[PDB]
């Protein structure tokens, strides 16, 4: 069940980096957030969609450096 902790950690990592992307809007932050989200298990198919939707929105706002 360490596999449950890994998946839970991927989820936290994603949530953190996505929140961080929303804060800096950099290309660097975009990459970390996007990769992190793509790593979240389909187990969290729903919050994964919400996180991804959040990424797409920051992209709609525009990046800066």
């Amino acid at each position: 069940t360490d596999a449950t902790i890994k998946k839970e950690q991927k989820l936290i990592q994603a949530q953190n980096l996505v929140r961080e992307f929303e804060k800096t809007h950099t290309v660097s932050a975009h990459a970390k957030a996007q990769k992190a989200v793509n790593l979240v298990s389909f187990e969290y198919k729903v919050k994964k969609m919400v996180l991804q939707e959040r990424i797409d929105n920051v992209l709609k706002q525009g990046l800066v450096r």
Partner: protein, 297 residues
């Protein structure tokens, strides 16, 4: 480090993907790799930060269109009713793996293709076979050569499985074992290789799993011409592709003493990708230079 390849030389790489299962990947390649390189070398500001969103849009479009060619088995081919290609499916994994930093990518699509390659196309001795060659033979680069095909293709598929590992670890149980078996095969036949191309690609594949050492590493290093390139008599494009695989191997080994001459040769080729039959050269040279820009001291 050396100077980055100027962003202006890369503007023609932002392309619209079109065509069927193979052609779509031919169009997707340059745009994915260009963005990857420009992101790593941080040239968006002094080049057009907004152009990046358009490029991401084209990547999104390629990805989406490629899904229309995903067969029930998770494998890919030019058309949905054409027998699936081992190389194309592995190439899709390779490209989508590098694009996980750029757009949304479905893990099940990616790992479904990895799983299929393992379960259906890997022999018990670790070799990966192609039962339905792609129509666009110009898109597979140096693998078009008929000699040392089992080695060249196994190295190619193994490279894709290794780059997908992070993404597919938790959902593809057989992945670790498959990587090992393919490695075993490459290792047992590496010393008998004759072509610089195979030496280089199997070299990178072995280096990623720390099995390129001792006499194998010596073979890899001494194959280089003037210590700065891996070449064979044939098209110059395969040599640019080979040398790029070799550079990735060297970076994997952290042999930064041997790296400088290789990067210099690559830069002096002034190869900026794009055009007919440039798929592997374009994707590889820039993946290699990006990795270099990211690793080298």
């Amino acid at each position: 480090g050396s100077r980055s390849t100027d962003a202006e030389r890369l503007k023609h790489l932002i392309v619209t993907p079109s065509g069927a299962g193979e052609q779509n990947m031919i169009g997707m390649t340059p745009t994915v790799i260009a963005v990857h390189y420009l992101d790593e070398t941080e040239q968006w500001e002094k080049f057009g930060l907004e152009k990046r969103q358009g490029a991401l849009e084209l990547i999104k479009k390629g990805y989406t269109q490629q899904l229309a060619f995903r067969q029930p088995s998770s494998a890919f081919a030019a058309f949905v009713k054409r027998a699936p290609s081992t190389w194309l499916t592995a190439y899709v994994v390779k490209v989508f793996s590098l694009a996980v930093n750029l757009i949304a990518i479905d893990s099940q699509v990616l790992c479904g293709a990895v799983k299929w390659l393992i379960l259906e196309k890997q022999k018990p001795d670790g070799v990966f076979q192609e039962d339905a060659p792609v129509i666009h033979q110009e898109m597979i680069g140096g693998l078009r050569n008929n000699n040392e095909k089992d080695m060249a293709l196994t190295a190619f598929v193994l490279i894709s499985l290794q780059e997908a590992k992070d993404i597919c670890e938790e959902q593809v149980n057989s992945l670790p074992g498959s990587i090992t078996k393919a490695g075993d095969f490459l290792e047992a036949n590496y010393m008998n290789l004759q072509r610089s191309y195979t030496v280089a690609i199997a070299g990178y594949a072995l280096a990623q799993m720390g099995r390129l050492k001792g006499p194998l590493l010596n073979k890899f290093l001494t194959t280089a011409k003037d210590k700065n390139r891996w070449e064979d008599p044939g098209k110059q494009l395969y040599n640019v592709e080979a040398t790029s695989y070799a550079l990735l191997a060297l970076l994997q080994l952290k042999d930064f003493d041997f790296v400088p001459p290789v990067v210099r040769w690559l830069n002096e080729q002034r190869y900026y990708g794009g055009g007919y039959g440039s798929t592997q050269a374009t994707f590889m040279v820039f993946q290699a230079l990006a990795q270099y820009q990211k690793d080298a001291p």
